[PDB]
Amino acid sequence: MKEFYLTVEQIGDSIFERYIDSNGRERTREVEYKPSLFAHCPESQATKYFDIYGKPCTRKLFANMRDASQWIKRMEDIGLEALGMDDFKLAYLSDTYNYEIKYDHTKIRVANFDIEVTSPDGFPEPSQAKHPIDAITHYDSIDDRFYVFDLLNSPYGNVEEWSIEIAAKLQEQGGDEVPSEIIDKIIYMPFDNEKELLMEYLNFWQQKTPVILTGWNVESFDIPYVYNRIKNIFGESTAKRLSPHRKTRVKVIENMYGSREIITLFGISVLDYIDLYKKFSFTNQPSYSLDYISEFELNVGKLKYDGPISKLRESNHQRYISYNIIDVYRVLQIDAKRQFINLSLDMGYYAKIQIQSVFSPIKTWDAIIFNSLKEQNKVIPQGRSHPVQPYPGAFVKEPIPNRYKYVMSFDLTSLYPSIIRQVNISPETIAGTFKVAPLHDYINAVAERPSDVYSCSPNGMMYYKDRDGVVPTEITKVFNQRKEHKGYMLAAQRNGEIIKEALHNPNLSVDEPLDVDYRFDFSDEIKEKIKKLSAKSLNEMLFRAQRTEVAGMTAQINRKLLINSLYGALGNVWFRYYDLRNATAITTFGQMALQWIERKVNEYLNEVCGTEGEAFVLYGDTDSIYVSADKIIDKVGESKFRDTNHWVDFLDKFARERMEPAIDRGFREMCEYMNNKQHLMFMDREAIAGPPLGSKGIGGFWTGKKRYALNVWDMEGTRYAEPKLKIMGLETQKSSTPKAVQKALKECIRRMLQEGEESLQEYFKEFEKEFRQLNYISIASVSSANNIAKYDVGGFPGPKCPFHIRGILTYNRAIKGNIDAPQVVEGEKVYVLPLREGNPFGDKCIAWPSGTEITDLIKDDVLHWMDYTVLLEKTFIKPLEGFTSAAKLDYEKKASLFDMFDF
Ligand SMILES: Nc1nc2c(ncn2[C@@H]2O[C@H](CO)[C@@H](O)[C@H]2O)c(=O)[nH]1
């Protein structure tokens, strides 16, 4: 069993690391690393070791690790360049784990927990943790259990224990609806006081010390709290014990907050699931409240409770404690389906880097290359910060606002990376520079062709078309691995169908499982010996395949990420290999290909249609384009098409046979113009959208850059049952808009695109009427009280103050008299509502903590007072209003000359 690390940390001149040994055991060792470095040597020498420039260098041994540090410091002082890997941890690894990796994972203590503290005012301050923690669920991958610590006594409330069984009941049985398959897997243990509680957890912890720490807002919240709190009632010395190496660092961060600390646990890789999500999600989202994502991801939703989230323990310790768990579980379920954590291992294991350093492309990439060069005997430069220069980003066409019946998209796969390789961009690949003409001309080819020996970029760059550039080759390497691992998972998946049915009537005596490398489809030789096998003898056969297809595919994705998070690191100042000219080269080229191909399209097209000065390319954005099929369709007339679906196939064959061809062909021309290394410019149709045929719906409309919506039918081949709406930046999303409204708007658009104005017009009257009977909450407007509520407490408000904070102060001036039942607003997420003027409150609008109902004393009044008309305008009419205008429509029909007359 070939070993591997877990956590590596550097303190003093010695490393400290947790790893599994040649026979599955998690141990530690404190190794005093003897770092190796380099410096350019006088040319005439004999050596391996030469930088990525030609220049030769010579090894430097430090024995003591911090000598190096003293050395480098020095060199730079003198003015001499110091080469090698400054981050020792990544260096260490490189040597010790020199081979390909192969990690177990079932062997890695991934702890997922979540604490709960009950605070008067719904939010507490992790900063000092004035209050006690009254709940803690702590899952253990290694154990498959959930450890639950409950505090029964508290100045905020002394409660009864919790019922395993009641939790085990259905809603109607006052049950917590808790999932069976978990139930037996709990280990509840209640306490009398906080000390005993923690103290134990501490011990619990010091015993089952995590490698990976997860949660939801675990980093920002849970983790700090703990730490602080402990130190508070126990003191630091003992708080420190939370780290295996019992060492630790506190870090403050800033912004629209101020103190936001993130404790850095020495020797445990912390991966807040939240971040970890946002990165690999590949799905932009509007809010990340746990229960929102669990909805989308598992449909389920969240444990519905009553009263504030601060009341709950007092008002119902039962559910308070159940939910706590559910949370942890929800996450579990997600990792298990999306598999993120697993991925990370793999990834961080691939690049041989500290696991959490997955959140940093710099870190990763750097390490990837470093290791690449290592077994190549070259030497990485020395990083050296440059300043922050505003090179442009990608292009985004200003679109004409209007309705657009038939339309179709196209995507340059990856793009940036492809560019890099299309132009052999890398730092040592930089050959020259040319007199640079205004880009505009270049895209029209009215510029003169620069260099005939060099690969060139529109910002005046020139690159050696010979030498195979570091960056470019390095990426290709990755790209092959994906092309390769993608196939792998296919073979063993499709090699699973093989064992799938030859196990429906398996049995032939009792067999011995076969030595198969599933990675490739079988062979008929092998295929015959399979039918000669039984369900017993097979099955481990079918587990490995379906699982090597699991496994293998994980990596295929891994690359997908890397490949995608590359430009992140290059466009980054701190990235060792960063260079502005390089960076700019990219974005500019990219910026070009877009309008280049955009022009080309139009040409070709209004030519093939034989129309004139007709701009078809309706909009483009970073790496996609939009073409108005409108006139193409009309050429052949709407009449012929007998099925909305009928034409859909049409555009498709067109794209694929007329279009596509012209593109590649037209991109070749560009590559040509640049004397580029190769052709890597692949853009393929990707979406088709429009009104159902016969339907007076408009198919789609735009409002401005990134402000658009449309009726999709085929999503890259995959045709659609009924349509599926693609909204973009239209506040259907923006958290702020009330739910009831969103669900509404979302609908108007559907009507528009699919049905026609009549349909819309009537619906308008609908929700309009029903507006006044809707439950207030579905109509309230959310927005964060980004705690600058402070800045306005001039007793009362004071101009240059927004609606939000206005509503909050006016609120608190009503909550003067608590009864304690009324929560107060602690710097986060609130409600907001109009109020007709001359209300007995002062100000016009109130807001209250999100998720909550309102203290009854004021409650009934508020709403009686509530401003309906206003609310509506601001919330619904206004945004809607926009749409219409852009798409050129009307929500209320023009006051006919013909009214008064009943027909
Ligand atoms: N080839 C190479 N080795 C390096 C570099 N930086 C540090 N080393 C270390 O020097 C030793 C010999 O390669 C190994 O321990 C490397 O991990 C670098 O930039 N290139």
Curated annotation (Swiss-Prot):
Binding site for Mg(2+) 1: 114, 116, 327
Catalyses which reaction(s): DNA(n) + a 2'-deoxyribonucleoside 5'-triphosphate = DNA(n+1) + diphosphate
Residues the record lists as binding Mg(2+) 4: 411-412, 623
Cofactor(s), names only, from the UniProt record: Mg(2+)
Start and end residues of each stretch annotated as Polymerase: 380-903
Binding of substrate, residues: 414-416, 482, 560
Region named Beta hairpin: 248-264
GO biological process: bidirectional double-stranded viral DNA replication; DNA-templated DNA replication
Any one GO MF annotation of this record: 3'-5' exonuclease activity
Positions of the UniProt region annotated as Interaction with the polymerase clamp: 897-903
SMART domains: POLBc (SM00486)
InterPro entries membership: DNA-dir_DNA_pol_B, DNA-dir_DNA_pol_B_CS, DNA-dir_DNA_pol_B_exonuc, DNA-dir_DNA_pol_B_multi_dom, DNA/RNA_pol_sf, DNA_pol_palm_dom_sf, DNA_pol_type-B, DPOL_T4
Binding positions (Mg(2+) 2): 222, 327
UniProt entry keywords in alphabetical sequence: DNA replication, DNA-binding, DNA-directed DNA polymerase, Exonuclease, Hydrolase, Magnesium, Metal-binding, Multifunctional enzyme, Nuclease, Nucleotidyltransferase, Transferase, Viral DNA replication
Binding site for Mg(2+) 3: 411, 623
EC number(s) recorded for this UniProt protein: 2.7.7.7, 3.1.11.-
Annotated positions for site Optimization of metal coordination by the polymerase active site: 621, 706
Pfam families noted in UniProt: DNA_pol_B, DNA_pol_B_exo1
Region ranges (3'-5'exonuclease): 103-340
Site (Essential for viral replication): 714
SS bonds (residue pairs): none
Domain statement: The N-terminus contains the 3'-5' exonuclease activity. The C-terminus contains the polymerase activity and is involved in binding to the polymerase clamp protein. A beta hairpin structure is necessary for the proofreading function of the polymerase.
Described function: Replicates the viral genomic DNA. This polymerase possesses two enzymatic activities: DNA synthesis (polymerase) and an exonucleolytic activity that degrades single-stranded DNA in the 3'- to 5'-direction for proofreading purpose.
Description of how the protein assembles with itself and partners: Part of the replicase complex that includes the DNA polymerase, the polymerase clamp, the clamp loader complex, the single-stranded DNA binding protein, and the primase/helicase. Interacts with the polymerase clamp; this interaction constitutes the polymerase holoenzyme.
Family under the similarity heading: Belongs to the DNA polymerase type-B family.
Protein name: DNA-directed DNA polymerase
Species of the source: Escherichia phage RB69 (Bacteriophage RB69)
Organism phylogeny: Viruses, Duplodnaviria, Heunggongvirae, Uroviricota, Caudoviricetes
Gene: 43
